[PDB]
Amino acid sequence: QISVRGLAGVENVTELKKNFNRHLHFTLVKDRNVATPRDYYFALAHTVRDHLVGRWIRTQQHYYEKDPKRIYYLSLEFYMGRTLQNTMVNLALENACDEATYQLGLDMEELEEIEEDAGLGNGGLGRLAACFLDSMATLGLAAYGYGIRYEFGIFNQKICGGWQMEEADDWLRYGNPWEKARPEFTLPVHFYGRVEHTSGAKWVDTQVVLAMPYDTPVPGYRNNVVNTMRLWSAKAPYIQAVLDRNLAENISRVLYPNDNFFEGKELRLKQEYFVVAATLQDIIRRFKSFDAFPDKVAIQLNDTHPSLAIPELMRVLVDLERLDWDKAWEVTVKTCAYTNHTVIPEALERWPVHLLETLLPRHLQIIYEINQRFLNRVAAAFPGDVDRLRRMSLVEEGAVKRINMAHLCIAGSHAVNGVARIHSEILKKTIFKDFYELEPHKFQNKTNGITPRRWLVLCNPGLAEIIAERIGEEYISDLDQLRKLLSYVDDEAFIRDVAKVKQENKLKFAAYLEREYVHINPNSLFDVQVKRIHEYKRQLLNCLHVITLYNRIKKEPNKFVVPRTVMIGGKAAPGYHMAKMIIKLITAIGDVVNHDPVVGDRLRVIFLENYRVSLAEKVIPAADLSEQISTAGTEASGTGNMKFMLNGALTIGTMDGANVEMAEEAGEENFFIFGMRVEDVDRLDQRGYNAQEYYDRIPELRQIIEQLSSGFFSPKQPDLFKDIVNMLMHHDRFKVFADYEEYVKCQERVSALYKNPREWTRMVIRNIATSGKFSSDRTIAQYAREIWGVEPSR
Amino acid sequence: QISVRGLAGVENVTELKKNFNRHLHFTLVKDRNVATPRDYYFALAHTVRDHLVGRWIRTQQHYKDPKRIYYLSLEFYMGRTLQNTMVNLALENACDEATYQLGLDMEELEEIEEDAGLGNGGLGRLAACFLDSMATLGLAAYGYGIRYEFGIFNQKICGGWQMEEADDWLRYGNPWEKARPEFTLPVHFYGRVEHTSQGAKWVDTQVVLAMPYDTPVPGYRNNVVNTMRLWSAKAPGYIQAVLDRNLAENISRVLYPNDNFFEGKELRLKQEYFVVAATLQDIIRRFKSNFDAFPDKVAIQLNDTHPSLAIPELMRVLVDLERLDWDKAWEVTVKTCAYTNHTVIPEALERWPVHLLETLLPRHLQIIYEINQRFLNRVAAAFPGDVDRLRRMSLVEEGAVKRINMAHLCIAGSHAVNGVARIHSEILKKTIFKDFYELEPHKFQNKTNGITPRRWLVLCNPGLAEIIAERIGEEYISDLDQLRKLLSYVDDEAFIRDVAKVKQENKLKFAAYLEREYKHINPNSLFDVQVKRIHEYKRQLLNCLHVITLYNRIKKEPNKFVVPRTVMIGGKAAPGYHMAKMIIKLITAIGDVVNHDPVVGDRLRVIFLENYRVSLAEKVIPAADLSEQISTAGTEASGTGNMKFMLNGALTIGTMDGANVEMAEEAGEENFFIFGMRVEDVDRLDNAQEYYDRIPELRQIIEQLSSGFFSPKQPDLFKDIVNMLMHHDRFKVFADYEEYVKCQERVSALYKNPREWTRMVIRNIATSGKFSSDRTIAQYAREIWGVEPSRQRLPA
Ligand SMILES: O=C(CN1C(=O)[C@@H](NC(=O)c2cc3cc(Cl)sc3[nH]2)Cc2ccccc21)NCCO
Ligand SMILES: O=C(CN1C(=O)[C@@H](NC(=O)c2cc3cc(Cl)sc3[nH]2)Cc2ccccc21)NCCO
Ligand SMILES: *Cc1c(COP(=O)(O)O)cnc(C)c1O
Ligand SMILES: *Cc1c(COP(=O)(O)O)cnc(C)c1O
């Protein structure tokens, strides 16, 4: 039907159909009168994966021959989501498969709903790695993503009685047709033991866990390129001994549900080394099949989680390859680069020295050696600056001596980058200021991006098409060509069509909620905040605005208000008490608002259950207003924001992370910017933040806190939200009250624009047209030329 | 090359090569450039697997609405699946040609496949032969069991000692299983019994999911493909909660390596209820797709007492869930269930402590006591005033620990009870189940064990199969009684030559196997083979006494000629069993002296065959000259290894125990090396000292064992063997020693007469027909299940 999804030729369609029935017969062992809806998905899944094989083999054989420099994106997280539709898109098979399945009497989009999400990530950091994998393939880069095959991904969230309930994400339950086990490359990973020193060093008496690789294809956009994601699963090398094999194998069991937080879990450390040791061993093998090592190898560290790659490569070159220290260290630093994702201090990985001593004795030794030579450098550039040394040291002082993994990374990386312009500048000026003064050349910016395949062509084919009608399809892998749409801001047809595709998407998401769960008003402003639940994200600020909306209606029931459906989605860390309370608050607001006869259709507040990649694909194309309301200086970049912008939502936001650059690309008159700037946060910090001042001064704010505290939103348990109130009044690091007045005033302005369909749509066009910079193709190109030292090719 | 393996039709060969390359490419993602032998096995496995699916779908659709037979077993000792599949679909020759043209040795590919070693020994191997026979006899038969992640331990010999390694048989994936997610079921554990307005309900339980995997069971050239359904366990701070999922999933992780023993392990009971609860749920769903007709549509065969919980579980579903009255439900249950016993050894009997059942299965314990009361009321009615009889028949045993006897349970709830060999089925009626036979004589039957002539002849001994078919055709494969036509060829010069030719060929193949995988044996020696699980009752120790006697006799008379022997002993010991582990090390310790004495050289060799399993049996058994089957009379219920040796052309030295009796009967006692005490004779003792003093040769050997002749660095190592043989031998080894050695002299005397050795072998092979599992299954079908076997073909 839709030209962007390619051709459905007669002979090509008949092939798909024969191979569909073939797979149902031989692969799934079924007839047409016994086959389950899952069986049909799998037959199509296999039908599509057959088309990947040839190119995959050829792609990797092409790299062997050209022998380009190899990019290894090292990450504990790959938030991949579904694979079927994405594969069909990248290979231009979508229409021909849709027709094939229709002819056979099946709804392909219903079949697509059976695939489990590869939810191997927590949030932004993890989905960035997934977007990167897409872009690196589309740009022809010799790139491999290296990670862990968690048996269980991010927990599946159930909302029970208004509360978050965690259940296991058993994604591999029915099989993974999109992975290929490669047991020929099973490798030993070592733990514990001790270190002998001889006339070199020798790591002896270790416990072994095998690492078994599973390869998953990464198709580039219509370029016949198929790269690889390699994920390692833990494998053990009378009766109790056999069951005790579980302990070693628990290393790859489950993804740690920690978004932006650190705890020194020993199992976490084992995971990070597991991935590091196996990957690096695999990298060296491929290299041999070391002066030229950094000419042929780039290792990108996605946060400090794989920071162990620094001493581990030092361990291999020195202890096993018998290289001199200084030479191994030149090679190591030229190889590794580090991407920082957050300035929040509780997220910073600082491992107890004791824990590293027992588990990785040799690595501890090397860390201490790296630290001495590095501080000898700091002492030489800044002689007598004693306090600089203790600040820049990898070893932290205390009743628990710790290793600062970030400091390890900066010392062992030739490139250190932030994720948005403002965040990268924050690193030079504050958190890494000492490091910036020592080696300013190391410090870069690489503003995040999102893939316009999954986040436009895949999730919003209707928008992709109306754009295609005007400028062709070249934009899909050259997103800057969206600026051509500026010439259409006064086009009556395009204005009609943009509005039309939005309503259509809003209708589809409304059907999804009805079918799977709730009735939402299709004729209301879709107000959406989806992301992880954190204080810094300030879902709680959204909450105060929603209650403001509610109280304003109660104060003047007859007064028209632009009807809104307020949607908030996101998972809370299972151990995050405040985040769990925040989810409970949102549902409890909904309990009162959604049932008050006076309100009715004017205001609905719903918590979107189990926010994940496949849900993002559904809800973001249906959003009108994108909530991006972090307190300035807290959100390093954001990527959810870029998705909303590309899918036709207007943004209400602070001047934080990539919101700054989004406002710059679209012009600040097409953006609903509000609140404190970073400077204003410092002004409050230096003077001391008193939220009681705001309380005593703002009557509407006063009303809500008394509602919260007295029990208006928890009648059966009036005590319920006391921790939220006490925090907001006396321990708010995130100054929710300081931005309340500007937020509510700025939301009034949003409602004013919505009352005017035409000027809402024209502002929408101005956003879509200038989202081009926020393609991950742009991001990867900068990484490649500025850090990796390779040239992309489409 | 050979006729018995079918046609290598040019068109099949072309399509076989095409699908091989296709699978290598699409399924395996490989080129001939980076493909290993393992890739090549899997490419073939998939190619052959494809030929099963059409038949498999059409078979299960065909199931006419016949009565369905459900063989329930904790063990299915299947072995490998590639060759067996090709034989039954008549594709062996076509695939040998296909891989040849592709530059590959098909037999080298077959060696990659791991055994499905989901069994300990005979019991589990029996289930496997039974599935094959039931498919070949066209019965709507399902095998139900557990998918152990780790089968029977892989055995390595280190320092002459048994090492145990985990049988990670699933490591590279199993092409021969098909997961069936739509049929995942909840199995419940622990919880409590509460009482509602309408009956009892089992609530507040812990749930473990049961995930079914189906394996195709092809019939020999009849287009029938049945199913073995094997259940895998699946779970329904946060991190620890996810990790703790391992606990439920541990239920299906490992096969208990107990063979002749009962361990009251709680994890074992969980395994038993796991398979039973899921199976019965499955059975009832297919029945629904009135319970008076349940027995005419369902037969549940209980392989030993391991699945005995099926009795209270069927009662539970019928009463608590389906709401039938107790009496009617009980009628359905007894008419549906039948019990097979496999041993009389007291330590093997399952006797679960009442305390354990109460906690894990509180509702089943209630139902057990209710069954017991109604059963004992019955006993009291038939034999009024026999109080002792009541305590002896009760499902509940008194003592410091109250226990439920599962065998008493099975008989009470079964309409048929059978032993596995004529002699054993009789001793059941006369001793261990004497009282139950007196109450219900109609229930007690015999079903002599069998082995499949496909796997145990056409597959493992194709050369033998071929020379046989050259005389009588291929009809014998699924009609083994036709082997009696070979009796006519007993004076035939060509057949005598051919039988000898194929045996020497098999001996050369095994001698190459040993040199390749583990290195030397002399191919021109008598192959004296004892392979089976290691245990006192089996008497590997009697073999050791003969071996040492043979060694001492050559050292006393060095110039005297002796018929050269290669004595091979193979088998696994139970990892707890200290005495069985000592036996294995004693066998290697002997070997260590005898194999390095320059005066002996190639004249006598003693070797321990490492890692005996189904795939190894298929190698050594075709090569054996002498089958050792030397169990103390009364202890081996039937045996099955004995039958394999007979069909493959080995002579048998054995006691009149188990199926040895019927083997000798079929062939004629002239054609068998019978020795030692019969059952009657054993019942006249249970003093080994009497033998030691009267027999000077026996004396010398026991002086060598204790004084440290076979263990120099460890002088007292075998003190426990000496002490047990002298004082605590339950299996009177010393009592049969004398007859054993003399009978072994008559083995050697015949061997030095090659024509007469071979003629007797002919008489053995030709009368092995009865010991086909097709004969066993026909009987089960007719005499227990009430179904008619058919060798009728299905279309296409
Ligand atoms: O080497 C194998 C052989 N093998 C496959 O490669 C396996 N193939 C794939 O999983 C696979 C194939 C393709 C093509 C892709 Cl494109 S992604 C992908 N994955 C099929 C299979 C089935 C049963 C047993 C083994 C296999 N397996 C190791 C598994 O632990
Ligand atoms: O390559 C595959 C394809 N595959 C099957 O083999 C496929 N079917 C079988 O395992 C299978 C097929 C047949 C035919 C038989 Cl006859 S026995 C048997 N088993 C089911 C499946 C489901 C989900 C993902 C992949 C598969 N799997 C390797 C495991 O990742
Ligand atoms: C993009 C994405 C995130 C990150 O969104 P932010 O608003 O930038 O925090 C988190 N979760 C999912 C499922 C995503 O797709
Ligand atoms: C048949 C067989 C057995 C049973 O042999 P017996 O001598 O009757 O105990 C045990 N293990 C394997 C592998 C077999 O094939």
XYZ file of N, CA and C in Angstrom, chain B residues 190-302:
339
model
N 3.843 -28.735 47.357
C 3.603 -28.291 48.735
C 2.145 -27.866 48.952
N 1.925 -26.659 49.467
C 0.570 -26.161 49.712
C -0.190 -26.942 50.769
N -1.510 -26.770 50.787
C -2.377 -27.383 51.805
C -3.699 -27.861 51.214
N -4.311 -28.839 51.881
C -5.656 -29.303 51.545
C -6.678 -28.537 52.385
N -7.609 -27.870 51.708
C -8.741 -27.229 52.377
C -10.042 -27.824 51.845
N -11.133 -27.620 52.581
C -12.402 -28.265 52.260
C -13.505 -27.243 52.006
N -14.057 -27.289 50.795
C -15.121 -26.378 50.381
C -16.481 -27.062 50.497
N -17.513 -26.411 49.967
C -18.882 -26.928 50.007
C -19.083 -28.203 49.180
N -18.164 -28.474 48.253
C -18.344 -29.554 47.276
C -17.295 -30.671 47.337
N -16.160 -30.396 47.975
C -15.113 -31.400 48.145
C -13.804 -30.817 48.634
N -12.744 -31.614 48.532
C -11.407 -31.166 48.894
C -10.775 -30.366 47.760
N -9.991 -29.361 48.139
C -9.222 -28.568 47.191
C -7.789 -28.397 47.684
N -6.844 -28.547 46.759
C -5.417 -28.379 47.029
C -5.026 -26.951 46.643
N -4.757 -26.131 47.660
C -4.524 -24.695 47.472
C -3.164 -24.261 48.002
N -2.792 -23.019 47.679
C -1.611 -22.352 48.238
C -0.303 -23.053 47.852
N -0.320 -23.692 46.690
C 0.811 -24.475 46.211
C 1.874 -23.606 45.558
N 3.089 -24.147 45.467
C 4.126 -23.577 44.622
C 3.995 -24.215 43.240
N 4.050 -23.395 42.197
C 3.878 -23.884 40.832
C 5.224 -24.012 40.128
N 5.398 -25.129 39.429
C 6.504 -25.309 38.504
C 5.879 -25.623 37.150
N 6.254 -24.871 36.119
C 5.720 -25.136 34.784
C 6.418 -26.343 34.182
N 5.685 -27.076 33.354
C 6.202 -28.257 32.690
C 6.148 -28.023 31.184
N 7.322 -27.934 30.568
C 7.406 -27.611 29.150
C 7.710 -28.849 28.318
N 6.751 -29.247 27.461
C 6.864 -30.458 26.661
C 7.742 -30.289 25.429
N 8.628 -31.260 25.226
C 9.418 -31.399 24.011
C 9.104 -32.768 23.397
N 8.810 -32.779 22.099
C 8.460 -33.996 21.367
C 9.620 -34.490 20.512
N 9.915 -35.792 20.623
C 10.888 -36.488 19.778
C 10.163 -37.514 18.899
N 10.406 -37.485 17.576
C 9.777 -38.481 16.700
C 10.329 -39.889 16.909
N 9.423 -40.867 16.887
C 9.777 -42.279 16.991
C 9.285 -42.973 15.713
N 10.196 -43.168 14.737
C 9.838 -43.794 13.474
C 9.688 -45.309 13.575
N 8.719 -45.841 12.843
C 8.571 -47.280 12.720
C 9.396 -47.769 11.544
N 9.735 -49.054 11.564
C 10.472 -49.655 10.464
C 9.619 -49.752 9.201
N 9.854 -48.815 8.282
C 9.274 -48.813 6.929
C 7.737 -48.925 6.853
N 7.039 -48.360 7.838
C 5.572 -48.409 7.861
C 4.912 -47.030 7.814
N 5.738 -45.997 7.630
C 5.302 -44.599 7.537
C 4.628 -44.052 8.799
N 4.814 -44.761 9.906
C 4.286 -44.344 11.186
C 5.404 -43.637 11.948
N 5.087 -42.464 12.488
C 6.010 -41.777 13.387
C 5.271 -41.390 14.660
N 5.590 -42.083 15.754
C 5.027 -41.778 17.070
C 5.826 -40.715 17.821
N 5.476 -40.487 19.086
C 6.055 -39.399 19.878
C 6.535 -39.865 21.250
N 7.731 -39.419 21.625
C 8.161 -39.441 23.012
C 8.091 -37.991 23.475
N 7.205 -37.720 24.437
C 7.053 -36.384 25.014
C 7.818 -36.259 26.339
N 8.801 -35.357 26.363
C 9.675 -35.167 27.526
C 9.526 -33.770 28.116
N 9.213 -33.726 29.409
C 8.890 -32.489 30.119
C 10.126 -31.826 30.724
N 10.243 -30.513 30.513
C 11.310 -29.682 31.094
C 10.727 -28.712 32.114
N 11.447 -28.495 33.216
C 10.967 -27.615 34.292
C 11.256 -26.133 34.050
N 10.260 -25.307 34.353
C 10.344 -23.879 34.111
C 9.668 -23.118 35.237
N 10.362 -22.122 35.774
C 9.806 -21.243 36.792
C 8.638 -20.430 36.235
N 7.575 -20.246 37.045
C 6.525 -19.301 36.700
C 7.085 -17.884 36.701
N 15.725 -9.753 47.566
C 15.718 -8.731 46.526
C 15.314 -9.289 45.178
N 15.084 -8.394 44.223
C 14.685 -8.758 42.861
C 15.683 -9.692 42.191
N 16.966 -9.340 42.267
C 18.031 -10.154 41.671
C 17.991 -11.594 42.207
N 17.933 -11.739 43.529
C 17.923 -13.057 44.165
C 16.668 -13.852 43.807
N 15.545 -13.154 43.675
C 14.294 -13.765 43.241
C 14.440 -14.395 41.851
N 15.054 -13.659 40.919
C 15.332 -14.179 39.568
C 16.305 -15.371 39.599
N 17.388 -15.240 40.359
C 18.348 -16.335 40.521
C 17.691 -17.584 41.128
N 16.863 -17.381 42.155
C 16.190 -18.481 42.863
C 15.228 -19.281 41.982
N 14.983 -18.807 40.762
C 14.242 -19.584 39.754
C 14.919 -20.914 39.444
N 16.244 -20.938 39.562
C 17.028 -22.168 39.420
C 16.481 -23.337 40.253
N 15.864 -23.010 41.389
C 15.418 -23.999 42.373
C 14.315 -24.907 41.843
N 13.264 -24.312 41.283
C 12.206 -25.072 40.611
C 12.750 -25.785 39.376
N 13.543 -25.065 38.584
C 14.100 -25.594 37.334
C 15.141 -26.715 37.533
N 15.713 -26.807 38.739
C 16.551 -27.953 39.132
C 15.839 -29.320 39.079
N 14.504 -29.313 39.105
C 13.722 -30.556 39.026
C 14.093 -31.404 37.797
N 14.288 -30.760 36.650
C 14.608 -31.490 35.435
C 16.059 -31.287 35.017
N 16.962 -31.099 35.973
C 18.321 -30.817 35.550
C 19.166 -32.067 35.335
N 19.057 -33.039 36.236
C 19.947 -34.198 36.206
C 19.228 -35.512 36.529
N 19.566 -36.549 35.756
C 19.135 -37.923 36.011
C 19.856 -38.485 37.236
N 19.101 -39.041 38.179
C 19.707 -39.721 39.319
C 20.418 -40.976 38.846
N 21.722 -41.080 39.149
C 22.532 -42.175 38.632
C 22.473 -43.428 39.507
N 21.392 -43.584 40.268
C 21.121 -44.835 40.968
C 20.558 -45.850 39.990
N 21.067 -47.072 40.060
C 20.604 -48.136 39.183
C 19.801 -49.172 39.984
N 20.471 -49.865 40.902
C 19.857 -50.946 41.687
C 19.477 -50.522 43.113
N 19.296 -49.217 43.314
C 19.210 -48.651 44.654
C 18.082 -47.617 44.785
N 17.532 -47.485 45.993
C 16.548 -46.439 46.290
C 17.124 -45.417 47.252
N 17.237 -44.177 46.779
C 17.595 -43.044 47.621
C 16.352 -42.188 47.813
N 15.973 -41.988 49.071
C 14.822 -41.162 49.417
C 15.080 -39.667 49.297
N 15.603 -39.248 48.147
C 15.912 -37.840 47.894
C 14.663 -37.075 47.492
N 14.435 -35.932 48.145
C 13.247 -35.106 47.898
C 13.152 -34.598 46.458
N 14.306 -34.284 45.876
C 14.383 -33.863 44.480
C 13.941 -35.002 43.560
N 14.164 -36.237 44.001
C 13.774 -37.404 43.218
C 12.255 -37.553 43.199
N 11.629 -37.412 44.365
C 10.174 -37.421 44.481
C 9.536 -36.318 43.622
N 10.175 -35.151 43.586
C 9.701 -34.029 42.774
C 9.727 -34.362 41.285
N 10.791 -35.039 40.857
C 10.907 -35.522 39.486
C 9.737 -36.431 39.148
N 9.467 -37.371 40.047
C 8.391 -38.339 39.890
C 7.014 -37.706 39.785
N 6.714 -36.735 40.638
C 5.412 -36.088 40.555
C 5.323 -35.141 39.352
N 6.419 -34.437 39.081
C 6.541 -33.597 37.889
C 6.057 -34.300 36.611
N 6.722 -35.389 36.231
C 6.350 -36.157 35.025
C 4.898 -36.670 35.069
N 4.489 -37.181 36.226
C 3.138 -37.723 36.447
C 2.002 -36.682 36.321
N 2.148 -35.540 36.994
C 1.121 -34.490 36.963
C 0.913 -33.897 35.560
N 2.014 -33.572 34.883
C 1.948 -33.030 33.520
C 1.401 -34.053 32.510
N 1.916 -35.279 32.577
C 1.475 -36.367 31.699
C -0.034 -36.589 31.813
N -0.532 -36.738 33.040
C -1.954 -37.038 33.256
C -2.876 -35.917 32.786
N -2.466 -34.675 33.038
C -3.110 -33.492 32.464
C -3.201 -33.570 30.938
N -2.122 -34.034 30.312
C -2.014 -34.093 28.859
C -2.952 -35.165 28.320
N -2.902 -36.328 28.970
C -3.715 -37.505 28.654
C -5.220 -37.200 28.681
N -5.647 -36.446 29.690
C -7.060 -36.127 29.895
C -7.562 -35.083 28.890
N -6.683 -34.162 28.489
C -7.018 -33.161 27.482
C -7.276 -33.805 26.117
N -6.409 -34.742 25.719
C -6.582 -35.486 24.468
C -7.787 -36.422 24.483
N -8.135 -36.911 25.670
C -9.346 -37.710 25.854
C -10.586 -36.848 25.618
N -10.595 -35.655 26.210
C -11.683 -34.687 26.040
C -11.802 -34.181 24.599
N -10.685 -34.202 23.868
C -10.628 -33.725 22.485
C -10.861 -34.853 21.486
N -17.763 -38.595 28.900
C -17.916 -39.358 30.133
C -16.699 -40.221 30.414
N -16.325 -40.316 31.690
C -15.101 -41.016 32.090
C -15.246 -42.537 32.214
N -16.440 -43.050 31.925
C -16.650 -44.493 31.826
C -15.835 -45.104 30.682
N -15.685 -44.357 29.589
C -14.945 -44.827 28.417
C -13.442 -44.513 28.472
N -13.001 -43.850 29.544
C -11.582 -43.506 29.735
C -10.660 -44.726 29.585
N -10.980 -45.856 30.265
C -10.183 -47.088 30.163
C -10.146 -47.762 28.785
N -11.141 -47.489 27.939
C -11.177 -48.020 26.580
C -10.442 -47.104 25.606
N -10.059 -45.922 26.089
C -9.350 -44.922 25.283
C -7.943 -44.622 25.812
N -7.679 -45.037 27.048
C -6.387 -44.803 27.690
C -5.820 -46.049 28.383
N -4.569 -46.376 28.057
C -3.762 -47.283 28.876
C -2.518 -46.555 29.394
N -2.310 -46.622 30.709
C -1.127 -46.055 31.352
C -0.268 -47.189 31.904
N 0.905 -47.371 31.298
C 1.838 -48.401 31.715
C 2.910 -47.786 32.602
N 3.016 -48.301 33.821
C 3.958 -47.791 34.807
C 5.272 -48.574 34.773
